Structure formats: structure tokens, C-alpha cells
Enzyme design. Structure first.
Site, mmCIF file in Angstrom:
data_model
loop_
_atom_site.group_PDB
_atom_site.id
_atom_site.type_symbol
_atom_site.label_atom_id
_atom_site.label_comp_id
_atom_site.label_asym_id
_atom_site.label_seq_id
_atom_site.Cartn_x
_atom_site.Cartn_y
_atom_site.Cartn_z
ATOM 1 N N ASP A 147 0.922 -1.243 -0.027
ATOM 2 C CA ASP A 147 -0.012 0.012 -0.024
ATOM 3 C C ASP A 147 0.857 1.085 -0.011
ATOM 4 O O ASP A 147 1.993 1.092 0.121
ATOM 5 C CB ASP A 147 -1.043 -0.028 1.282
ATOM 6 C CG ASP A 147 -1.938 1.034 1.240
ATOM 7 O OD1 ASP A 147 -1.647 2.126 2.111
ATOM 8 O OD2 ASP A 147 -2.683 1.171 0.318
ATOM 9 N N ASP A 149 -0.409 4.883 0.850
ATOM 10 C CA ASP A 149 -0.736 6.175 1.934
ATOM 11 C C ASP A 149 -0.958 5.504 3.463
ATOM 12 O O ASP A 149 -1.558 4.568 3.579
ATOM 13 C CB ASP A 149 -2.122 6.631 1.646
ATOM 14 C CG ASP A 149 -1.713 7.950 0.658
ATOM 15 O OD1 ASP A 149 -0.933 8.543 0.513
ATOM 16 O OD2 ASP A 149 -2.619 7.892 -0.520
ATOM 17 N N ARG A 264 -10.679 11.059 -10.186
ATOM 18 C CA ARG A 264 -11.257 10.208 -10.938
ATOM 19 C C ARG A 264 -10.557 8.852 -11.052
ATOM 20 O O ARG A 264 -9.678 8.666 -11.362
ATOM 21 C CB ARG A 264 -11.288 10.792 -12.399
ATOM 22 C CG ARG A 264 -11.202 9.720 -13.450
ATOM 23 C CD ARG A 264 -11.706 10.186 -14.971
ATOM 24 N NE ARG A 264 -12.076 9.076 -15.842
ATOM 25 C CZ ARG A 264 -12.832 8.016 -16.000
ATOM 26 N NH1 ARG A 264 -13.302 7.604 -14.759
ATOM 27 N NH2 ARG A 264 -12.906 7.050 -16.902
#
Ligand SMILES: [Mg+2]
Length: 418
Positions: A147, A149, A264
């Protein structure tokens, strides 16, 4: 002091970061003009205590703490580098890196005290060592999935300036290239602007393979491949069109730039409408949310919903199998010539609950056989990763990504430099 000056500052700097990392990996020379761009971004971000920015009709306070500490760390790192480089000017970068004490630089900044850092570091080194040993055992380098963040990078208060410092980009790239046959990164955000490719200080076409939309879109080898896997082709193009009337709208004052700042994704648009505690003048918040359903036009296929106080999503289902990181991972590994099934070790690094499907997948394929470093969360999560695998001697918990960064840097110094 304004918005566009903040964005533009951070981005030009970040591009420069990339250039520096390039110099650092490829044995090219390091321009003090680059470093000086970094230095100046740093010393502006501290002048007039965390700073506020403005347009015309609107002003908002922004936490620049992560940007700042990123730059700060980078500056003391780079200084150490350059003053060791000034002579011998031909000394190989990695050796100079082995002379630089990264540990003490990172082991100032953090939530516990120092001795905690020390010991988590020691443990993490040991862990990583076991992983490397995988390759001496099977004659194949192992797999590394992580991962972003919370995990490889400290949390940032806003997604657009979420920026990877040099030292971590270097250490990570080197670690991945030297020790792994595969290194994949799974993020929630999109690929390009502002996705993770723009946020990273790292090569992107090299040993690490970056994704976003939870594995729905990857950057490889040279282009971007996107797995829709949901009814339709309809509002894939509509989400594109909406994301447009949004590019259209942030021209005006309002500020893109809040907690997630209009991402997006493949399947959805996810939108910061409000911060913590309260900023953004709830009136303006509401007017902009109705700008959002303004642009949302049939009643076009896609559907709104106020996910939370602070955030909101424009979703396109139909359709889904409800894609998670596990699926991103599996799709990737299968797309390549490979499998998690193979004998050898897999290392997974995670921070939230969202990284668990990744461990589930891994152990499903390879129960022997999976390593996890998680950062740094509660009893519940710790317990859960302990659950989804066996021991618990295969689990490593550390409080911040810099522990991993220091451990990796150490392992590199030891195995690469001797
Ligand atoms: Mg996370």
C-alpha cells in the site's frame, strides 16, 4: 501565497525531486540548482503556524505539515550526500549512501520516543532479512506488494500535495530492484494528474509497478492498462465527461485541494466537499455539491451519494464483483508471467483494513509463505492480520513508514555495499 502558486510550486519541485532521484540511481551528477529548488520551496513553506491560501472569492487554511517535513528530511539527507560527494566526486552513490546516517535523520521525527523507533527498526531489519533469504532458498527473487498512503508514505492532509520524498524513493527503488522479482504498489487514487505517478519521486517504468483505483488501472510497461469489469462502457466515458466539467470548474473560485481533491477513479469520482474540523464555509460546500449534480447532466446512469461528512462519491454501478486490492494484485501477477502460488516468500505492507484482501489472496495461494509489515494501527487490525495468516512470527508491526525506510536502507547498505 495563492493556490496556483502552491500547486505549481509543489509540482515543479516534485518534478525536480524525480530528476534528483534519477541522478542518484543512474550515477549522474547532482546539480546544486536542483537541491536549491528544494531548499527554496522549504524556506517559503515556512515564512509568515500552518499556512493559508486564497483565490479571489475564497480563502482556506491548509495543513502543510507533511510537505514541510518531507522537504526538511530530504534537505538534511541530500546535504549529507553532497558534502560526502564533493570529494570523492567519483565515489559510487550507493557507497556514499552507506556512509550517510539515515537512521538518525528519521529517528528524530516521530510519535513515541526514540528507543521505540530503534527497536521497531531492529525488528524490521530482521524481518526483511528473512524475506531476502527467500531468494537464497528458492533461486528466485521474492515478491513485494505494498500500500502507499500510511504505508510507504506518511499521511498528508490533502491528496494533491501528497508528495514522496527523495530518500524513500531511492531506498525503495534500490530495495525493489536488488531484492525482488516483482514490486507492486496498490493505491486507492488514480494514475495521473493528480494520481500516484505524479505524486511519486520514483522511476515508474523501472522495478516498481504502480497502480491506482485499487488495482483497476496499472502503469506498464510503457502505457496504462485499465480493467473496467463492470457494466458499462456507458459511464466510463460519462465519468470521464463529468471529470471534465470538473476540470472546467476548478478554474473558478473553487478550491480543488481538500481532503481528497476530486479523484477520477476507474469506477467512480470521489470528492472532498468538507474538511476536518470545519473549513470551507458550509454554504460554499453546498453550492459546489450542487455544481456537482449540475454537471451530472436521461438521468445519466451514474449515481451520487454522501459517503461521509467530509467526502462524497459519484459512482457508476452498474456494475461490479466489488473489486478490491486482492483482485488488483491477482490480475497483475497473472498478467505477468507469474504466481503468488510459487514456493518462496511474499512480503506485504499495509496500513488500513483495505490491505487485508491482499493478505487473504497471498495466503490463499501461499500459506507458508507470506510476510506482512503493517503500519501502525490498533489492536483490532494487528489482531486481524494475525488472524488472516498463522503466526505472528510472520507479522511485523511498526508505527510509521520511516521505520521501514531506515530498515531497507540498512539492508541495502549491508548486502549491496558489504
Ligand atoms: Mg492506506
Amino acid at each position: 501565497q495563492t493556490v496556483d502558486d502552491f500547486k505549481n510550486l509543489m509540482y515543479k519541485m516534485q518534478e525536480t525531486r524525480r530528476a534528483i532521484v534519477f541522478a542518484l540511481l543512474n550515477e549522474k551528477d547532482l546539480t546544486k540548482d536542483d537541491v536549491e529548488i528544494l531548499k527554496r520551496a522549504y524556506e517559503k513553506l515556512t515564512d509568515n503556524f500552518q499556512r493559508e491560501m486564497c483565490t479571489l472569492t475564497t480563502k482556506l487554511s491548509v495543513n502543510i505539515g507533511d510537505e514541510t517535513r518531507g522537504l526538511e528530511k530530504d534537505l538534511k539527507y541530500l546535504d549529507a550526500l553532497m558534502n560526502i560527494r564533493r570529494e570523492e566526486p567519483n565515489l559510487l552513490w550507493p557507497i556514499i549512501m552507506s556512509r550517510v546516517d539515515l537512521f538518525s535523520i528519521l529517528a528524530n521525527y516521530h510519535p513515541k520516543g526514540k528507543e521505540t523507533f530503534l527497536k521497531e527498526y531492529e525488528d524490521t531489519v530482521k524481518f526483511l532479512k528473512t524475506f531476502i533469504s527467500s531468494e537464497a532458498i528458492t533461486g528466485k527473487k521474492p515478491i513485494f506488494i505494498t500500500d502507499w498512503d500510511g504505508t510507504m508514505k506518511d499521511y498528508c492532509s490533502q491528496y494533491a500535495t501528497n508528495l514522496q520524498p527523495v530518500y524513500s524513493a531511492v531506498g525503495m527503488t534500490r530495495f525493489a530492484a536488488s531484492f525482488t522479482r516483482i514490486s507492486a504498489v496498490l493505491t486507492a487514487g488514480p494514475l495521473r494528474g493528480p494520481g500516484i505517478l505524479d505524486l511519486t519521486a520514483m522511476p515508474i517504468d523501472g522495478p516498481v509497478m504502480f497502480s491506482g483505483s485499487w488495482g483497476r488501472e496499472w502503469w506498464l510497461s510503457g502505457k496504462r492498462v485499465v480493467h473496467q469489469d463492470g457494466i458499462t462502457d456507458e459511464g466510463f466515458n460519462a465519468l470521464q465527461r463529468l471529470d471534465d466539467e470538473m476540470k472546467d470548474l476548478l478554474h473558478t473560485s473553487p478550491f480543488a485541494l481538500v481532503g481528497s481533491g476530486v479523484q477520477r477513479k476507474v469506477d467512480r469520482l470521489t470528492l472532498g466537499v468538507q474538511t476536518v474540523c470545519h473549513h470551507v464555509t458550509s454554504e460554499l460546500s453546498n453550492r459546489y455539491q450542487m455544481a456537482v449534480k449540475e454537471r451530472m447532466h436521461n438521468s445519466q446512469i451514474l449515481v451520487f451519494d454522501p459517503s461521509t461528512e467530509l467526502e462524497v462519491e459519484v459512482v457508476a454501478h452498474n456494475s461490479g464483483i466489488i473489486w478490491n486490492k486482492g483482485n488488483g494484485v491477482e490480475r497483475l501477477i497473472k498478467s505477468l508471467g507469474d504466481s503468488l502460488q510459487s514456493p518462496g516468500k511474499i512480503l506485504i505492507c499495509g496500513d488500513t483494513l483495505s490491505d487485508i484482501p491482499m493478505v487473504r489472496q497471498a495466503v490463499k495461494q501461499n500459506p507458508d509463505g507470506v510476510l506482512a509489515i503493517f503500519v501502525g494501527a490498533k489492536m483490532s487490525l494487528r489482531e486481524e492480520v494475525k488472524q488472516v495468516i498463522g503466526d505472528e512470527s510472520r507479522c511485523c508491526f511498526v508505527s510509521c513508514p520511516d521505520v521501514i525506510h531506515a530498515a531497507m536502507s540498512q539492508i541495502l547498505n549491508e548486502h549491496c555495499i558489504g
